[PDB]
């Protein structure tokens with residue numbers, strides 16, 4: 001029972017870490033898409049926006 | 050190409066795998082005596098097995114919560130993709146976007162949407178120049194003691210003559226007063242050349 | 249309760265062809281989908297009721 | 299400690315495989331090349347660079363070319379020194395019309411989960427025990443229904459832009 | 466979850482296979498980072514090289530072009546940007562594209578935009594003098610081409626002075 | 638629908654998305670970009 005209590009506590013921590021990493025990865029992916037749009041429109045051309 | 054329609058197959062496979070992982074945790078006991086609820090309801094003391102049933106509920110309720118959170122994340126991703134697709138439909142199909150690499154590689158002409166399972170496919174018709182030749186250019190031309198600049202085009206060299214042509218297609222034209230506009234003198238422009246301007 | 253396999257669902261006459269030694273049928277998700285009748289030899293599909 | 303990854307050029311091509319021990323030294327594993335990303339067994343290193351085929355890490359990629367798997371530093375592309383000058387202009391004399399496809403996911407399957415049936419499965423004792431944990435069933439239902447109605451708006455915002463059905 | 470105790474490993478199975486679901490999520494995040502870098506820097510299919518003569522009509526790109534005397538072939542601005550910016554079960558995977566390859570992609574994007582303008586993004590790299598392509602950008606923003614040619618020395622000095630202040634702005 | 642998990646059908650069928658695509662195509666081949674404005 002003590003091992004199950006330790007496994008459950010450490011497993012939920014890894015799940016929270018994975019969820020936070022997913023959220024931060026979505027943020028970084030949005031930023032990278034913005035940078036890729038900015039690379040093609042501002043560097044590879046001239047933007048009227 | 051097998052990797053052509055992978056992004057939609059990836060989404061449907063992620064959904065199927067999430068459903069299978071959710072239905073697989075049903076067979077997990079989460080440290081209890083077993084996972085079959087009927088057996089636990091028929092192998093222990095009814096007033097005592099309440100704390101044992103509490104362990105199965107938390108194991109299945111928290112799995113449903115993780116499933117809902119992952120579905121929210123995937124829904125955010127799919128909504129970003131759908132907003133991008135709507136912007137592409139409004140800008141590339143309903144018009145001619147001047148944005149580079151947004152409606153395909155090259156100068157975008159027009160686009161045609163295509164229906165796809167849980168997605169959309171855009172056929173980007175673009176303009177790609179080819180067969181280029183290099184010539185000698187000059188910023189301005191001094192004929193009547195005044196510098197002439199092209200209105201819409203670029204001065205090119207015939208080797209022994211000078212022409213004015215559009216910057217995206219080689220179409221030589223005689224450098225007349227209609228193709229060029231005069232502005233200022235000739236001692237203030239670097240690289241100016243001498244050539245007659247047809248009147 | 250088919251020879252010990254206890255469940256709940258609708259029983260319909262299936263068109264499947266089990267092997268002579270097989271008794272149960274399961275899908276990809278590892279769940280009972282079809283069960284051979286003990287007395288006769290027919291195969292009955294098992295689907296969630298409603 | 300580290301993960302073991304298998305590099306295969308596909309079973310349709312050949313059955314040869316190369317194992318990659320990520321992040322470890324080649325001397326502590328039980329033909330071999332100490333790649334900056336780990337020890338690579340079953341793929342010889344070559345100096346002839348090509349385009350990346352099978353990513354490995356640290357600028358090294360694997361490929362199948364000749365009946366053996368080879369590892370190489372990926373080349374970013376062919377070198378093109380544009381003939382720049384003070385007065386050299388390049389004007390294209392021809393053109394080509396090209397069509398490029400772009401696939402974008404718009405929606406996904408609208409799923410819905412029955413709380414009592416999934417957690418309990420027609421158990422009367424279990425169904426009354428769910429109330430002690432609050433209304434967590436309502437939150438999941440409202441969250442899943444919000445996703446379902448969101449997929450219908452995704453398809454609506456992408457395709458339903460025309461006011462009239464043109465023939 | 467278990468470390469070295471074997472009694473935990475077989476006991477982890479009775480709780481679930483979460484270690485498998487989590488490791489597949491981290492691999493997706495890991496391969497997403499390699500795709501993010503390729504979508505930004507790998508937009509060109511050819512590695513354009515800067516000409517041996519660094520004259521571009523008065524414009525000075527020494528602060529942004531690669532320095533052959535410095536290691537890693539970085540530019541001074543990239544040098545400043547780089548200078549300013551195995552555990553208990555967790556590992557750090559190396560990126561697919563190294564810093565020298567991202568720097569080479571950046572050099573290709575920079576050498577192409579100074580020798581070909583915007584033509585290398587739409588197709589083949591059409592060579593064009595830098596004062597010529599600068600007049601096209603002036604014609605795009607809404608001023609005639611003669612404004613640049615009659616003030617090329619002033620615009621070149623304003624460009625060189627502004628690039629020189631970028632290092633001070635990012636350092637201070 | 639097997640174990641409490643149900644899959645709801647989309648509001649717009651595949652034939653309606655096809656009709657929307659056909660309308661967009663017929664508009665862009667016969668009217669250019671004018672039908673969007």
Ligand SMILES: *[C@@H]1O[C@H](CO)[C@@H](O[C@@H]2O[C@H](CO)[C@@H](O[C@@H]3O[C@H](CO)[C@@H](O)[C@H](O)[C@@H]3O)[C@H](O)[C@H]2NC(C)=O)[C@H](O)[C@H]1NC(C)=O
Nearest residue numbers: 177178179180181182218219220390391392393394395396
């Ligand atoms: C611009 O590029 C296009 C595409 O390459 C050129 O069209 C090509 O013109 C050549 C010469 O007329 C064609 O070759 C001929 O093909 C026929 C068979 O169709 C053959 O019987 C002849 O003996 C000859 O080989 C070629 O097919 C054609 N390409 C296409 C796709 O139609 C065009 O000439 C170029 N224009 C300039 C000004 O360079």
Ligand SMILES: *[C@@H]1O[C@H](CO)[C@@H](O[C@@H]2O[C@H](CO)[C@@H](O)[C@H](O)[C@H]2NC(C)=O)[C@H](O)[C@H]1NC(C)=O
Nearest residue numbers: 184205206207208209210211212220221222223
């Ligand atoms: C300059 O362009 C002309 C076409 O406009 C090329 O053709 C010559 O045209 C001149 C008339 O100005 C004739 O006298 C020549 O006989 C033409 N050449 C030939 C080979 O027919 C001319 O070749 C171009 N100049 C160069 C140096 O190529």
Ligand SMILES: *[C@@H]1O[C@H](CO)[C@@H](O[C@@H]2O[C@H](CO)[C@@H](O)[C@H](O)[C@H]2NC(C)=O)[C@H](O)[C@H]1NC(C)=O
Nearest residue numbers: 190191192193194195235236240241242243244
């Ligand atoms: C373009 O024409 C101008 C004027 O016709 C040339 O300028 C002359 O250059 C010679 C030699 O340097 C001087 O002796 C004259 O006094 C200049 N004229 C004037 C009005 O200043 C110029 O050299 C010509 N350029 C080319 C390339 O032919």
Ligand SMILES: *[C@@H]1O[C@H](CO)[C@@H](O[C@@H]2O[C@H](CO)[C@@H](O)[C@H](O)[C@H]2NC(C)=O)[C@H](O)[C@H]1NC(C)=O
Nearest residue numbers: 251268269270271284285286287288289290291
């Ligand atoms: C179990 O007993 C029943 C009852 O006899 C068998 O069913 C008979 O099967 C024969 C052969 O197909 C038919 O001619 C009879 O009409 C059936 N009788 C009834 C009442 O259905 C059944 O075959 C037996 N099971 C096995 C495996 O032999």
Ligand SMILES: *[C@@H]1O[C@H](CO)[C@@H](O[C@@H]2O[C@H](CO)[C@@H](O)[C@H](O)[C@H]2NC(C)=O)[C@H](O)[C@H]1NC(C)=O
Nearest residue numbers: 381382383384385386516518519520521522523
């Ligand atoms: C383009 O023009 C520049 C500037 O006139 C030329 O650079 C000069 O080259 C000569 C010969 O090597 C040197 O003596 C000068 O010091 C250079 N000037 C500067 C400001 O660097 C360049 O050679 C020209 N390019 C071509 C192809 O003609």
Ligand SMILES: *[C@@H]1O[C@H](CO)[C@@H](O[C@@H]2O[C@H](CO)[C@@H](O)[C@H](O)[C@H]2NC(C)=O)[C@H](O)[C@H]1NC(C)=O
Nearest residue numbers: 519520521523524525526527528541625628629
């Ligand atoms: C272009 O810019 C570079 C750097 O700003 C200039 O190099 C400087 O030259 C002066 C005078 O020779 C030196 O005192 C500085 O130390 C140099 N800077 C560096 C960072 O080394 C260069 O002179 C400019 N012009 C050209 C044509 O390159």
Ligand SMILES: *[C@@H]1O[C@H](CO)[C@@H](O)[C@H](O)[C@H]1NC(C)=O
Nearest residue numbers: 182183184185380381386388
């Ligand atoms: C044009 O480009 C070719 C190679 O692309 C080069 O050899 C030549 O010197 C350039 N200039 C002229 C005038 O042909």
Ligand SMILES: *[C@@H]1O[C@H](CO)[C@@H](O)[C@H](O)[C@H]1NC(C)=O
Nearest residue numbers: 322323324325326331332333
């Ligand atoms: C680890 O790998 C490096 C690189 O080949 C090598 O120099 C070093 O000796 C290795 N360490 C051990 C303990 O084998």
